Design a protein around this nucleic acid. Structure first.
Ligand SMILES: [K+]
Ligand SMILES: [Mg+2]
Ligand SMILES: [Mg+2]
Ligand SMILES: [Mg+2]
Ligand SMILES: [Mg+2]
Ligand SMILES: [Mg+2]
Ligand SMILES: [Mg+2]
Ligand SMILES: [Mg+2]
Ligand SMILES: [Mg+2]
Ligand SMILES: [Mg+2]
Ligand SMILES: [Mg+2]
Ligand SMILES: [Mg+2]
Ligand SMILES: [Mg+2]
Ligand SMILES: [Mg+2]
Ligand SMILES: [Mg+2]
Ligand SMILES: [Mg+2]
Ligand SMILES: [Mg+2]
Ligand SMILES: [Mg+2]
Ligand SMILES: [Mg+2]
Ligand SMILES: [Mg+2]
Ligand SMILES: [Mg+2]
Ligand SMILES: [Zn+2]
Lengths: 111, 42, 54, 120
RNA sequence: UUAAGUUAUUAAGGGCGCACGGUGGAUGCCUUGGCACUAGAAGCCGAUGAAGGACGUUACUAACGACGAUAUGCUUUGGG
RNA sequence: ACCGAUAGUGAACCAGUACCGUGAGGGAAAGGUGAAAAGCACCCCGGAAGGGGAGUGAAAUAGAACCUGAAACCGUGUGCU
RNA sequence: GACAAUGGUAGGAGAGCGUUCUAAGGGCGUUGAAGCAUGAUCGUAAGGACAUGUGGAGCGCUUAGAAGUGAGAAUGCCGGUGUGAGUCGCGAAAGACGGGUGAGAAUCCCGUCCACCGAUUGACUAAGGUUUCCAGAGGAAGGCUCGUCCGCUCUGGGUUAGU
RNA sequence: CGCGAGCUGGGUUCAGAACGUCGUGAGACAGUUCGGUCCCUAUCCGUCGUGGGCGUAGGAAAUUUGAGAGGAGCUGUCCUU
RNA sequence: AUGAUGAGGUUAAUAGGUUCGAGGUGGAAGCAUGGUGACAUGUGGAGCUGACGAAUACUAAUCGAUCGAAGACUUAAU
């Protein structure tokens, strides 16, 4: 079986989220929690809430025991942007992109 | 310094409604704005 | 100081190998066994380091 | 020695503030480098409190701040008084190592390593 | 066992193909709106204050629309 | 034997608006849930957003710039290398 | 059947594919149209069918007619997304600690210590701007970081003259 | 007439001015004179340094020959014969 | 620069502190004494002393975690 949980329109950029997801992908859930809770990056709280949501709604809805679980696929997709403007010199503008993400975390018992 | 140093008096005694209607051609301005549909005249 | 050629996906990805971050200096806390912590650092949960609360 | 993102005089004042705050509070939450530098300051001050002479009060006033702490007897007292009267009497057999450090973990804002430093 | 020779495995990462996704808003379908015109009517308003606007009126009121201290409307005649 | 939302009016939408300019003046972008709002009671994670189940619905893989949803682009998994 | 010709720019000639609409005729479609995607399909070419997934309502086919009738380039126009790149930069400057607040704290509040200005970074005040004032709530966006905070957002209040 | 994304910018070679001379004149002179803004965060190759991966048919630690490569390569004065 | 290289990681002298020194500065603070005073003298080559030498576990290098072989085939001599 499988369970997932998602987080959409996250303010962090995907290049800066995927760095952390590369540490979670394919690992025990408690291990992965600790990775996130000990890494000083700023996407790690958000990934952690997605993860604990997955574990919660697996334990609740699909009825799986939290112990046996591993992180099967944790992926981050580009969401929208918010286009912004940083004034550089001589009347020239320079664009800024406040990128977004779609943090997904999928949890399995191995069968 | 810069080239707009504001003043209400100098704004209204030049670009103002009364200065327009004081003049033949300044009335054409308001007509062009009334004819175009601008919510703000002068 | 200005590129003549775009940087392909291939070169982009060949360069973005070593940019990753590593697994931290993680260990277990023996006061609680699980709740893995950083080595040579206090445990946030147990408030412990070599047995003694802090 | 070590320089802390500060010029010479700013460094001196930061160090005196950290020493004094330690003397008041008996433990402080700081960054590891500032800790590693102020431990020297503190320990030399404790040594002066142990030597206990007038010249040693005079030399420790060159490095401490004039602060007022309320005691648990609701009493007024200074950092230097506290030092030479309490702290040097605690450590009369201890030959150095008047201070320890505990690496806590990485701070959110700046990714700095926080520590706790106390005078056990 | 030793000597000589031959050869693979590896994939940090990459390429090709496939599958699944996301962003993005093309395409298809549609139309509240527009374009060009036909027939008929009409071809001005205003000092008994114009056209155009400002300010305000609702139970709650920011805005569009209608309205004007008789103010989100008053009377009458007919329709319904 | 006109357009069908980069078209057709500058304007299908609160457009001569927002914005720019002292000023005359210039001058945009922006359409679609569903038959009907029946517009997600309720439980779980979360501080919230957001999500997962449940239930409305034919359809939520229709959940509010909500018909379809291409390409560039970003990624995950893997067969051959 | 025999024989021959068939490189090709500017360019001349000819036969055609396709697109949108229309007339006529014959037809398909919620038992699933167009459109999109996938395929190892047919034709001498432009290009045409068939299936399957999606999709949810219009569309082909024959003959003929009319055109806003085919795009890879115009330092083309509009929009979208990338590379540069996790790279410059984050805007003259002294902050440290303790206690709180809170899901979350270098960044908010209080206290202390230190420092900066001090013909002033102070006090008033004409223009100008026009509610940014104040109080209580909030953290989407703004803030070149964070944010429990704010000149931001919500709600409600606030400007009293005979001189 | 090596080298200005390595410098300078005296000189020539923009606009100002003045002398001689030419020209009716505007103005002109390989005639002279005073003065006069030198933009760039390096993608690729290249170069100098510095590391990770794998390979070198077991996995490791140390010492190592040298296919090759690079460097250095100067010269006076004095004394004696 | 960062990685790296090297010294060490409690069976421990790696750094800090502590006690001794070297080198450097050059005669602390307090007290007394002579002077109206500025000052001078004695106690005393005084006291201070970041990086250098030595000794010393007083503090921190904790408990731990990960990676890392079982050695292909063929031919010849044994
Ligand atoms: K925020
Ligand atoms: Mg400007
Ligand atoms: Mg100074
Ligand atoms: Mg009636
Ligand atoms: Mg239009
Ligand atoms: Mg469209
Ligand atoms: Mg859609
Ligand atoms: Mg031929
Ligand atoms: Mg030919
Ligand atoms: Mg055309
Ligand atoms: Mg950085
Ligand atoms: Mg670069
Ligand atoms: Mg600043
Ligand atoms: Mg305020
Ligand atoms: Mg040259
Ligand atoms: Mg130059
Ligand atoms: Mg030159
Ligand atoms: Mg030139
Ligand atoms: Mg003459
Ligand atoms: Mg010349
Ligand atoms: Mg000059
Ligand atoms: Zn613990």
């Amino acid at each position: 079986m499988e369970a997932k949980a998602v987080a959409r329109t996250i303010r962090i950029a995907p290049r800066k989220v995927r760095l952390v997801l590369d540490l979670i992908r394919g690992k025990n859930a408690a291990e992965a929690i600790a990775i996130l809770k000990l890494t000083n990056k700023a996407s790690s709280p958000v990934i952690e809430k997605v993860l604990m949501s997955a574990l919660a709604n697996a334990e609740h809805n699909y009825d799986m025991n939290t112990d046996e679980l591993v992180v099967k696929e944790a992926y981050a997709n580009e969401g929208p942007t918010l286009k912004r403007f940083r004034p550089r010199a001589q009347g020239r503008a320079s664009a800024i992109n406040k990128r977004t993400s779609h943090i997904t975390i999928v949890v399995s018992d191995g069968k | 310094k810069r080239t707009y140093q504001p003043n209400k008096r100098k704004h209204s005694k030049v670009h103002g409604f009364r200065k327009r209607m004081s003049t033949k051609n300044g009335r054409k301005v308001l007509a062009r704005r009334r004819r175009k549909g601008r919510k703000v005249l002068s | 100081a200005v590129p003549k050629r775009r940087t392909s996906k291939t070169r982009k990805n060949k360069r973005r190998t070593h940019f990753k971050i590593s697994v931290p200096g993680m260990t277990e806390c023996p006061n609680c066994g699980r709740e893995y912590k950083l080595s040579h650092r206090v445990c946030k949960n147990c408030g412990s380091y070599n047995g003694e609360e802090v | 020695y070590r320089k802390l993102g500060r010029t010479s005089d700013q460094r001196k004042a930061m160090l005196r503030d950290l020493a004094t705050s330690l003397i008041i509070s008996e433990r402080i939450e700081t960054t590891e480098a500032r800790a590693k530098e102020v431990r020297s300051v503190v320990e030399k001050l404790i040594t002066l409190g142990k030597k206990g002479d007038l010249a040693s009060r005079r030399n420790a006033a060159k490095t401490l701040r004039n602060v007022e702490i309320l005691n648990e007897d609701e009493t007024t007292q200074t950092a230097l008084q506290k030092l030479f009267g309490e702290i040097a009497e605690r450590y009369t057999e201890r030959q150095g190592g008047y201070t320890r450090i505990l690496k806590q973990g990485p701070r959110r804002g700046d990714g700095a390593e926080s520590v706790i430093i106390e005078l056990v």
